[PDB]
Amino acid sequence: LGIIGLFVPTFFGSYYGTILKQTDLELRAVHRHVVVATGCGESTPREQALEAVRFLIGRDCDGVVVISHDLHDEDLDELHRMHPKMVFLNRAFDALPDASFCPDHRRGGELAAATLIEHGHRKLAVISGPFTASDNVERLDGFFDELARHGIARDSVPLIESDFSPEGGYAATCQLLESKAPFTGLFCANDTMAVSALARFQQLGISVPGDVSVIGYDDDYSAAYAAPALTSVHIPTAELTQNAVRWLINQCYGTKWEIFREFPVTVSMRASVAR
Amino acid sequence: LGIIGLFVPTFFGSYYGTILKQTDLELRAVHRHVVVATGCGESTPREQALEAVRFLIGRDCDGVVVISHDLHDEDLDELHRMHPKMVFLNRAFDALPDASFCPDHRRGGELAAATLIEHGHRKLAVISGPFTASDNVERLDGFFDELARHGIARDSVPLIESDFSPEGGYAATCQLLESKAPFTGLFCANDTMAVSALARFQQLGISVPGDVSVIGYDDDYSAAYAAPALTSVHIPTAELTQNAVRWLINQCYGTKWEIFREFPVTVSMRASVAR
Numbered sequence: 001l002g003i004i005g006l007f008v009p010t011f012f013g014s015y016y017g018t019i020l021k022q023t024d025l026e027l028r029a030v031h032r033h034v035v036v037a038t039g040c041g042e043s044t045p046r047e048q049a050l051e052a053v054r055f056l057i058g059r060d061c062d063g064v065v066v067i068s069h070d071l072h073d074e075d076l077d078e079l080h081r082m083h084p085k086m087v088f089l090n091r092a093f094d095a096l097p098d099a100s101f102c103p104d105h106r107r108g109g110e111l112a113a114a115t116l117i118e119h120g121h122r123k124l125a126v127i128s129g130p131f132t133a134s135d136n137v138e139r140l141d142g143f144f145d146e147l148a149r150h151g152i153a154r155d156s157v158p159l160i161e162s163d164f165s166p167e168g169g170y171a172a173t174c175q176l177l178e179s180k181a182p183f184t185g186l187f188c189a190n191d192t193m194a195v196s197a198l199a200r201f202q203q204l205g206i207s208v209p210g211d212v213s214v215i216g217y218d219d220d221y222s223a224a225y226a227a228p229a230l231t232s233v234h235i236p237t238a239e240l241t242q243n244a245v246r247w248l249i250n251q252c253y254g255t256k257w258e259i260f261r262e263f264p265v266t267v268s269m270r271a272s273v274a275r
Numbered sequence: 276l277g278i279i280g281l282f283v284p285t286f287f288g289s290y291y292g293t294i295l296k297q298t299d300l301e302l303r304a305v306h307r308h309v310v311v312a313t314g315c316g317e318s319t320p321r322e323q324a325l326e327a328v329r330f331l332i333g334r335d336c337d338g339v340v341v342i343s344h345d346l347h348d349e350d351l352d353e354l355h356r357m358h359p360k361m362v363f364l365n366r367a368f369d370a371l372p373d374a375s376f377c378p379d380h381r382r383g384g385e386l387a388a389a390t391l392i393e394h395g396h397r398k399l400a401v402i403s404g405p406f407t408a409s410d411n412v413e414r415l416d417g418f419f420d421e422l423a424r425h426g427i428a429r430d431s432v433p434l435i436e437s438d439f440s441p442e443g444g445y446a447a448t449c450q451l452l453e454s455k456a457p458f459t460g461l462f463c464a465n466d467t468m469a470v471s472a473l474a475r476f477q478q479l480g481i482s483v484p485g486d487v488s489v490i491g492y493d494d495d496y497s498a499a500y501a502a503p504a505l506t507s508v509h510i511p512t513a514e515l516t517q518n519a520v521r522w523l524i525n526q527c528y529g530t531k532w533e534i535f536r537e538f539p540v541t542v543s544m545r546a547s548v549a550r
Contacts, residue, residue, distance in 0.1 A: 002334070003310065011292040011299075012496075020286040021313065028315045033334055035278065035308045038299055059277070059308055145518050148466035195500055202502035203546075221287075225441050225470055227502045271478075 002032045004248065005056030005064040007049065009039055014220040015194055015237060017068075019089065022241040023065055030253060035061060045070035050079075052191060057083045063252040065089065065245060069133035087248040090135050101244035101261060105135050108265045109142030112187050112215050115231065117150055119275050121185030121213060125159055127172040127197065128189040129164045136189055139217065143187060158183060162193055169193025173200040184212060185273075189233055191216040191223050198226055198272070209274030215274050219268045229270035236263035241246045277307045279523065280339040281332030282324065284314055286381055288467055289495040290512060291342075294364065295372045297516040298340055305528060310336060320345035325354075332358045338527040340364065340520060344408035358375060362523040364516060365410050376519035376536060380410050380516075383508045383540045384417030387462050387490050390506065390542050394550050396460030396488060399432055402447040402472065403464040404439045411464055414492065433458060437468055444468025448475040459487060466491040466498050466507055473501055473547070484549030504545035511538035 006023050008016045020036065027034050037056050041050030049068040056064050057079070067089040068080070073081055076093055086099060089191040093100040116124055126143065134263035144154040158181040162168040176183075177200070194216035196259075201208050208214050208228055212225060216223060219234035246257035281298050283291045289401060295311065302309050311333050314323030324343040331339050332354070341354070342364040351368055355361055368375040387423075391399055401418065404411040419429040433456040437443040444467060452475070463469035469491035476483050483489050483503055491498060494509035514535075521532035 011286070011295040014290055017286040017292075020311070024311065024313055025315060026284075028312075029332070033310045033312070033330075035310050036295070036299065037303075037308070038296065040303045055303070055308075075455075080411060156365050166496065170500065197499045197505070199502050203504075221441065222497070225445065225474045229474070260286055 001060055001062055003035050003059075003061050004032065004252065005059065005061030006034050006036050006246075007053050007056060007064070007068065008036065009045070009070065010067050011038060014222050015190070015218050016072065018220075018237050019067060019241050022238055023245050025243060026245040026249060030249060030255060032253070035059065046072065046075070050075060053079050054082070056186070057196070063087070063248045065248060067091075069130065069135055085251055086250065087244045089186045089244050091132070096218060098247065098261075099241045101247070102135070103235050103240055103263065104265055105138040105235075106142035106145075108217065108235060109139040109144075110146045111265060111267050113143045113146035115215055115269075115273060116185040116187065116213060117146070118274055119185070119213060122152070123183045124152070124183065124185045125176055125183035125189065126157060126159045126187045126189075127162055127169060127176065127193050128159060129162060131161055137163050139189060162189070164190050164192060166192055166196050169196030170200060173197040177204070186212055186214045188214065188216050191218045191220040191226075194230055194232070195222065195226050198230070200230070205230060208272055213273040215273055224270065225267070227273070228272050231270045231273040232268050234266045234268045236265065239263045276335055276337055278310050278332065278334075278336050279307065279520075279527065281309050281311050282313070282328050282331060282339070282341045282343065282347065284320070284324065284343050286313060289497050293495075294342060294516050297513055298520050299417070301517060301520040301524060304526060305530060307321060309526070310334065310348045321350070325350060328354050329357070336364070338523045340523060342366075344405065344410055345461065347373070355411050360523065360526055362519045364519050366505070367409070367527050368522065371396040373522065373536075376515045376522070377410070378510050378512075378515055378538065379540055380413040383492065383510060384414040384416030384419075385421045386540060386542050387492060387508050388418045388421035388545075390490055390548060391488060392421070394488060394548055395459070399427070399460045399462065400438055400451055401432060401434045401462045401464075402451065402460035402468050403434060404437060404468075406436055414464060433451070435461065439465050439467060441467055441471050444471030445475060447514065448472040452479070455548075460546035461487055461489045463489065463491050464500075465497040466493045466505060466513055469507070470497065470501050473503070473505070483547055488548040490548055498543070499545065501547070504549040505546050506545045507543050509541045509543045511540065514538045
């Protein structure tokens with residue numbers, strides 16, 4: 001058919017924009033197209049992804065690129081037997097490992113904690129994504145491993161579960177401030193929620209990095225222009241996507257790209273974190 | 276083929292995300308798909324759009340949705356004779372008017388000026404998009420018509436031409452501050468550049484709305500979470516897209532949607548504008 005299908009949970013956020021751009025790019029390079037699909041309807045986030053991916057498979061896309069933290073591992077196996085030419089981004093796929101392209105989130109969380117701790121912060125707080133998102137769980141695991149090495153118990157750290165969205169981050173920041181739990185450093189599971197945190201703090205006169213140091217995750221390109229410029233853990237999303245899509249193109253169209261799966265995660269130091 | 280093609284100059288910005296979402300939505304509703312294409316390569320923005328649209332037409336999409344402010348009117352006519360089943364968003368198409376779905380940008384600019392003027396601002400400044408973008412020219416025209424009604428000459432207002440991007444807005448704000456031109460109120464052609472302006476002002480201790488009142492355009496959903504919450508001119512992008520795509524679906528697949536082309540533009544008052 002000359003088309004590869006692509007599922008993303010939403011078109012918003014520079015993170016998903018990056019995935020869309022790179023997929024379109026690699027396909028254009030081989031003179032082929034991309035059909036995009038996102039969650040629609042009144043079903044649950046999970047079922048919305050199942051229906052969307054099945055909709056792509058039904059169109060007979062030569063290959064399907066999939067990213068979703070709402071799908072359960074068992075769903076990945078089902079979708080894969082329905083269409084063996086698939087690649088999964090940001091999550092593992094044990095039945096067929098190289099069909100999975102995922103950065104080192106454990107290391108990512110570790111760096112977030114180290115940034116804060118190295119700046120003298122001992123009382124920290126966290127606003128995360130859904131507890132059922134594996135990319136989030138490993139992100140937090142790494143964060144708390146680093147905290148443990150410094151004598152800080154996971155159980156003593158205020159943690160608000162959220163959904164990675166702008167409104168979710170805003171509500172989570174409010175819930176945190178309302179709890180009265182003390183904290184001088186805040187870790188947000190993604191830049192989107194971090195920006196909303198900066199929004200609330202500004203509304204209440206809570207200075208950043210003055211009174212609170214905030215660090216995000218992803219290093220989406222909305223961060224450099226946050227107020228103040230958002231310090232964020234840099235995830236190699238463009239590179240992993242480029243390689244995930246190239247791997248798929250090899251299987252589908254006979255290209256011979258060399259595939260790389262290891263990229264470093266670093267911290268983009270800006271102005272939201274201070275001593 | 277059961278596919279409609281869609282060209283957007285970029286996947287970034289909630290404005291384009293809205294267009295992508297609504298297009299995907301209306302097509303899913305009729306059990307069909309969308310192939311997306313954006314500008315790629317080292318050609319000029321204009322030629323990148325010409326090549327991308329021709330790439331969609333070459334795949335024999337049943338219909339093609341196109342939005343670009345880099346294309347010249349003559350390009351719209353050429354692309355249209357290559358594929359008569361096309362719809363154009365955010366710009367006019369004189370040869371075939373109902374193939375064009377565009378909000379009232381003149382009125383939009385007018386409201387931006389009135390908001391500022393009604394808040395007592397007499398010394399204003401503007402950061403616009405490219406002068407060659409028709410949606411921008413009418414936006415500015417309306418802005419300056421309102422200023423003229425208040426005894427303010429277009430020629431006395433600092434105007435920095437930019438490109439609608441985050442980095443462009445940042446650079447334009449810097450150029451403005453460096454010029455030393457006085458101003459207490461700033462109008463940004465789009466929320467993206469407005470957010471970058473808020474970024475610069477925060478870096479220099481220039482309070483908003485304290486020292487400078489800032490108003491954006493689009494009312495993209497990144498505005499409510501800007502710091503401070505960005506007051507913006509609300510453009511009915513979701514509605515026009517929904518109707519533009521429905522109109523196209525009628526012509527392509529036999530649906531019988533009633534089509535509406537008139538939606539009001541209003542101002543979303545938040546916290547970036549004060550007396």
